[PDB]
Amino acid sequence: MREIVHLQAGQCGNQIGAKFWEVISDEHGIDPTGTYHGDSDLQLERINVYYNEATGGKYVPRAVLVDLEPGTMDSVRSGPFGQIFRPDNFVFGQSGAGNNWAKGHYTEGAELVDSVLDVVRKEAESCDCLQGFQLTHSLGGGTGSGMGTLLISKIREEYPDRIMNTFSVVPSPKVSDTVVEPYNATLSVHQLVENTDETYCIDNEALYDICFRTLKLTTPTYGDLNHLVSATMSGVTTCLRFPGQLNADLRKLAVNMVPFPRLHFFMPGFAPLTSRGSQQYRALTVPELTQQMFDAKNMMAACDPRHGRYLTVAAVFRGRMSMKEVDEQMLNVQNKNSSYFVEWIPNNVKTAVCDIPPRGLKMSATFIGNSTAIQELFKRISEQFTAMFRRKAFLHWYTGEGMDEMEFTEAESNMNDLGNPVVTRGAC
Amino acid sequence: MREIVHLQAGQCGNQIGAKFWEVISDEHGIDPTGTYHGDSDLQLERINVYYNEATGGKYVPRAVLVDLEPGTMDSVRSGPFGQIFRPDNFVFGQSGAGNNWAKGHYTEGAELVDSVLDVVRKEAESCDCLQGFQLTHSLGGGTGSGMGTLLISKIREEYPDRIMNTFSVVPSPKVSDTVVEPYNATLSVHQLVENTDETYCIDNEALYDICFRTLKLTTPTYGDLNHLVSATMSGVTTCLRFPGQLNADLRKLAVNMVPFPRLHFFMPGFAPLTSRGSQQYRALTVPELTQQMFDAKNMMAACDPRHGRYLTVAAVFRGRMSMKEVDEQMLNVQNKNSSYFVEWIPNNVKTAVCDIPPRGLKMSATFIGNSTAIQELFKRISEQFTAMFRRKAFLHWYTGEGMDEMEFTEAESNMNDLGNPVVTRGAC
Amino acid sequence: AKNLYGPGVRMGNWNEDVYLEEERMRDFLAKRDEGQLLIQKNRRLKENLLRPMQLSVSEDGYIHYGDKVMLVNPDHPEVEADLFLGGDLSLCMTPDEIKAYLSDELEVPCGLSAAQTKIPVGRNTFTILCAAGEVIGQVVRYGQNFRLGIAEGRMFYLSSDHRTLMKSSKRSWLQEVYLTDEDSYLNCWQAAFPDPQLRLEYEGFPIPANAKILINHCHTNRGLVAHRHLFLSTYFGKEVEVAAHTYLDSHRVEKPKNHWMLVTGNP
Amino acid sequence: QRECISVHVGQAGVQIGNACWELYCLEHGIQPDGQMPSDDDSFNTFFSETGAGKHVPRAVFVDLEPTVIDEVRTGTYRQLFHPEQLITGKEDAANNYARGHYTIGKELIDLVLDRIRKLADQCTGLQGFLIFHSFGGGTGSGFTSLLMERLSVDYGKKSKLEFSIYPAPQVSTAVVEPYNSILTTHTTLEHSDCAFMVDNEAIYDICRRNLDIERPTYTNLNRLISQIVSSITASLRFDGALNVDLTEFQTNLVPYPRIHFPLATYAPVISAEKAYHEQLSVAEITNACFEPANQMVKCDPRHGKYMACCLLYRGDVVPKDVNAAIAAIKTKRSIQFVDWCPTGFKVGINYQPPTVVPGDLAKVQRAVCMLSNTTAIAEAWARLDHKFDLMYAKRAFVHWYVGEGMEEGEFSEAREDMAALEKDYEEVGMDSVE
Amino acid sequence: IYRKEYVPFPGHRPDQISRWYSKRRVEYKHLITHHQEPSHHHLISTYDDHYNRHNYNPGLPLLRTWNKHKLLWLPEKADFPLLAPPTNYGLYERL
Ligand SMILES: Nc1nc2c(ncn2[C@@H]2O[C@H](COP(=O)(O)OP(=O)(O)OP(=O)(O)O)[C@@H](O)[C@H]2O)c(=O)[nH]1
Ligand SMILES: Nc1nc2c(ncn2[C@@H]2O[C@H](COP(=O)(O)OP(=O)(O)O)[C@@H](O)[C@H]2O)c(=O)[nH]1
Ligand SMILES: Nc1nc2c(ncn2[C@@H]2O[C@H](COP(=O)(O)OP(=O)(O)O)[C@@H](O)[C@H]2O)c(=O)[nH]1
């Protein structure tokens, strides 16, 4: 019986944490009033993965609601599942992040991390074996970019052996809702690369491409987009909440997925996905799941798998099925797209099956892939950072907050340091 | 049985008396008139401890309400639960202290001290065996201080074996309701030391800290503040008032929490304090009550322990709990935090478990801990008192009022002294 | 850019538009036919809480036991706070409109208010029950232990107890008055005279139908008060809360918002 | 909790404030008496509560002279504004920075700071100051100069947004406008955090091309300015997808601490007879802003290079048509950026459509205020600098200034600092060569 | 000029419909991923299926015919056990 603490910061990380909690509550049978009203008992067998039991049958999520701007708090309480969190776990802040990484790193974020640390402590001692932490935030922007990395660094220093999964919203190349994303996200990536163990780079343009050219919608709003991230981030940690054959936890994913400690940059995928038109006409089979998974369209980062060899690939499956088709269908894709796999790792695909499918679905599967195609993200933001840092641009907002010049150079140096050993895998 | 003659002197004193007598009434059922309009028969069992049977199921609180201005008494009488106190028990005089510990310990109190001692003797003698008197006063301010200390003094001589406890309300650091408080307080500790057996040190500033931080109240009224001090006042007498396992009266909490005879200033703190809107999101498990009564907030004094070390700690749990857990928690904390506890005493903790819980709560607990941190208080007071007498400040009164300057000098002596006891034991 | 058309027109994403519209329309008609939607629940709860009743005839100008008598708070000239609220308010039932939502009626805490209505409307009609030993015909006396009940066919009783740090009045922080279903000493109130001088001799006399009396809970000696300064925002208009705390004035006299008049049928 | 103080300096400033506070009053409930009509907390950004529900503004309306503010407490809003908030003088500066800054400043600056302090006490989180003033009259120039020299010292950590009435390059309304502008730019360049710029000749064009009104009153210009400020100060009032606080304006539009001058642009400028015949889509509502004719300032950006643009959308807008419009604009060649700020868009989104005052603009469900910091404004600056050189070549109108305590050499300092500002403009300008 | 151009506006009550409806659009919670038919009772463990619930009871226990048009012995492979209540055993009653 093992716990994942779900912590989320920023106005993006907050609302993905919110949207995560309805799909977890529907999978575990919890209504907005907090009582269990469902049909099974497997949903209560391992309810102590996300929900602390209270008096009167009230299950309360072990979530930490963080942001510097006190505006998304009223929204996350305004959602339909608003009367489910502690009003102590909403940690407020009466200022603005101001779209500044230094503002969350060396100022009022750094005086709010003490209260957030007290909250994460007081929940952390209410466990028997805490498996780890799960931060959802946005790399580009404020609050969660800087002060989320404060929380990452502090809890990594305080618990040094717990599995850290961070779902990070990288900026998009086509559209950017923020000028200072090449500053914020690079300075956040430096803090990520000696800290967390499992990143998940999630791109808004990739999600929008899934919404049009896979989901085939017309007005994809943030909630409709946002839920896909919620679904993959529910499907990764499913063998801990529901039983199955050949289970897998987050360390099970990690020890199979990261070859080197620095090579911990994934990009995810959740594809039992289809349009409302094709919905009644899907003939759900394991080959049909695998083929539509491994296609370079459902991939949740703005990166092309055809431009780079996969290091390792995991398919956390869910549903009542025969896993023989699972085994030889991923064998077939491994042997077919052989040039897109590295030759120095045989059998680079992790298989795992959960018995219980998500509610309303017959079966599903979550793709987690360590690829060398992450360069179309990281190198891209590196040219953005260099071409903007050369003219010393937008800088006084960063250097006047108590921040020296040369750790920008350290950030660029240790992002180009990420560039090297994964360029190396393109030509072995 | 073991009755407890209650004594209250001063506005604060009579207002903390209002709530205490109201709280003990709600518990024992006695209505605002006396009749036991209650239920469980255990309630009327040990009523002697705090009540005396009049004529026909009428219980009259054993209290000698004292004040040097005929005013606070009237609010008490003409208040709700105010016709439960015998008319004669109310004592008062048509004069006044005028925040002058002097015009209380030698001038106005004298003429009235005879009157109170008469009432005190009557109640004390008319009993099977007085466990001990119990005074509630405000070291800051007159009457309660002067007349009050004069009582503990004249009272201690007549009865030199009865637990003379005291819920003194020491002045506060930041907040400073009065201005002469410096002298008043510093001038009463010398009396308290050589008079009281257990002197609990509650501070208005700490009650606020809790209200604001813990209870999450927004308009903390002095009523709620008198409630936290009454909650504790009842916990220290729960065993001798409601049958339970591991029973522990007052002299037990004095024989396992007063190392040396002059070290007797304990800092109190209740436990199940949670916001009205968070009361639904919690679990009254022994763990919870512990995690609370030991944090540096649930304390009712302004001397955080962390700074210093605990010579002893006493906990009286009010609820039907699992001995194993109560015991386990004690060992755990003592072991985990092992630098905030002294090393010259093994098992520096007394555990007690009264059954009958406080109405509304499944469990609960009061905390009485002798901590060397209490040094912080006498120092701040001395700091101020000495940062004044140096220039005979606000002294004309205290002097000509029939006194002398030498006493002031020795008050700072016994003060600076005790500062040492709670300094040497602070370090082997 | 493009023209971005709407419903009906067969261009662009019209196929998935009509698919989503049919799915949402099917969900709405399914909920409408099964009668599980929010407004249907609102209409049911409203008819149940707004069903009209009748008031008992006062054959003599005295309130008896077991008769349907409404509690009203009279109009006030008091100006101690500038934020006032109306006149001739009425003690009414207010179940909370999100924590109820589902099911049929809440539990041991319900909540009371004082609306601006003067007609007997069903959520304000109280039966003056017996509490102690009496019959359906005896007259209510000054300083006698009577009881207030209101109805699902389940008699809820007006109740309160002492102030703890778990519960209070909602907007203020004083004692809470709430509707229980249990039966104990906490349900019991009493009536007393407004004038403290000529009160103790009137103890032991009948109560007039429409007259100023004070309601004291006989476990805490606190009077029923409409806290006119503030407001409770609930569905049935906007009205005030009610609590229990005896407010005194410059003569040990009770303020006009301690006072509570009773209302019988006087056509 | 998220409040900002609106300071309204000059005759220009008090009537800008009149128009925008009328728009805020109609935006919220706020009747002109001071109470919302019978029967969320979005008012608690511009309106302080009071017992018996008298929502009072947090603004200050300062003028060195009567009449214009005297009629405010007499007209149709006589009960709304607090009587000590509206500050009146007794003698106008008479179009003179010397009188506004050195002689008639001191009997009123103490009262203005006292009012500012008492407003700032009643603020939990004060976000900063929004000042509205002219580069014209001495009341609008010198008093706000002294106001910066006081408040930037007193409140140096706070956010500061100006909404400057820049003098028209062609028509104008005064003869000493180059003097007043050249002095106020010098004395407020180092103290301003971000200064959005609005002109009168441009909106003179706007009301005859897009309003289709050949004879509009002069009230319509600050009615449109009221729409601009109600668009920019709206994310701290309501809720949206991209919630933009006042700090992101400076963070994404002020890269360097001397260049802080963006130009605004509105959209749906439609006048209610050509409103129910068009799509008013997101693509064209962005293309109308980025067309080089709808600017607040008569300076086309074809003769310039954009630095950073911040779009604030409000109403029935989904973020992804905004994304498509941004992609289309980045593919358009005639609109072109600098090479050192490639990601040059800041998107803020609010869901409330603009409430329309009974008047000229139309009821539209989509609006966007486009705040572009660009290098084109160097031409508009250098035009007044050329006029200033031609005016100062033989010392015209200098005796009025120097008789009021204004030192002569500070004119040369002002011209030198504006020349240095032209310089800073050009090397912010040209592309990468290294 | 002032009173002529800045008349008060009685009866000009602002609306709140559009912001609320745009909020409704910007947040269809299961109807985005939901497959062929809603079924909240769609959970049986592998041990519960292929162990102590025997097998699928309506399914063909010995009628294993040869479907030709899908060239395999279909009536056992195309079963996919979904019958019965879930694997409730007493934990619900105990809790
Ligand atoms: N909307 C609107 N704006 C106006 C109106 N009248 C003047 N303005 C603005 O006010 C500006 C001129 O005022 P200022 O230069 O500030 O005058 P001042 O600073 O008070 O100095 P004095 O002229 O001495 O009073 C013009 O440029 C306009 O932009 C008006 O009636 N309506
Ligand atoms: N999946 C998902 N993505 C989101 C959500 N909310 C925002 N985003 C993306 O987050 C980005 C901006 O977040 P940001 O302004 O940095 O939030 P901040 O951290 O509080 O400053 C936008 O570009 C959105 O596309 C969400 O709720 N779910
Ligand atoms: N806990 C509590 N403290 C109070 C109350 N009323 C007053 N005090 C404290 O009592 C102190 C002053 O009391 P004091 O003037 O000495 O009363 P006196 O002894 O009659 O002179 C103040 O600092 C208050 O903080 C109360 O109702 N409850």
Report on this structure.
The PDB classes it as structural protein. The entry lists the keywords axoneme, cilia, microtubule, dynein, brain ventricle, doublet microtubule (DMT), structural protein. The entry is titled "Atomic model of porcine brain ventricles cilia doublet microtubule (48-nm periodicity)". Chains A, B are Tubulin beta chain. The organism of A, B is Sus scrofa. Chain C is Cilia and flagella associated protein 161. This is part of a larger assembly, with two copies of chain A (428 residues), one copy of chain C (267 residues), one copy of chain D (434 residues) and one copy of chain E (95 residues). The two termini of chain A are 41 Å apart. Chain A has helices at 10-27, 42-45, 72-78, 101-105, 109-124, 147-158, 181-193, 204-213, 222-235, 250-257, 286-294, 323-336, 375-389, 396-399, 406-423, and strands at residues 2-9, 51-53, 59-61, 63-66, 90-91, 129-138, 163-170, 198-203, 265-270, 310-319, 349-354, 363-371. Chain A has 428 residues and is an alpha/beta fold. The longest helix of chain A has 18 residues, at 10-27. In chain A, strand 2 and strand 3 (59-61) form a beta hairpin. Chain C has 267 residues and is an alpha+beta fold. Chain C has helices at residues 14-34, 38-50; strands spanning 68-73, 89-93, 112-115, 125-129, 146-150, 156-160, 175-180, 188-192, 212-217, 222-226, 232-233, 238-244, 260-263. In chain C, strands 1, 2, 3, 4, 5, 6, 7, 8, 9, 10, 11, 12 and 13 form a 13-stranded antiparallel beta sheet that branches. Chain D has 13 helices and twelve strands. Chain D is of the alpha/beta class and 434 residues long. In chain D, helix 1 packs across helix 4 and helix 5 crosses helix 11 (377-392). In chain D, the strands form three sheets. A six-stranded parallel beta sheet of chain D has the order 5-4-1-6-7-8, with helices on both faces. A four-stranded mixed beta sheet of chain D has the order 9-12-10-11, with helices on both faces. With 95 residues, chain E is mostly helical. Helices cover 27% and strands 0% of the residues of chain E. Chain E has helices at residues 2-5, 17-26, 46-49, 74-77, 91-94. The A-C interface holds A 33, 83, 216-218, 275-277 and C 12-13, 15-17, 19-20, 23, 98-99, 102. Bound molecules: guanosine-5'-triphosphate and guanosine-5'-diphosphate (GDP) (2 copies). The site of one guanosine-5'-diphosphate (GDP) has 20 residues of chain B, from helix 1, helix 8 and helix 9.
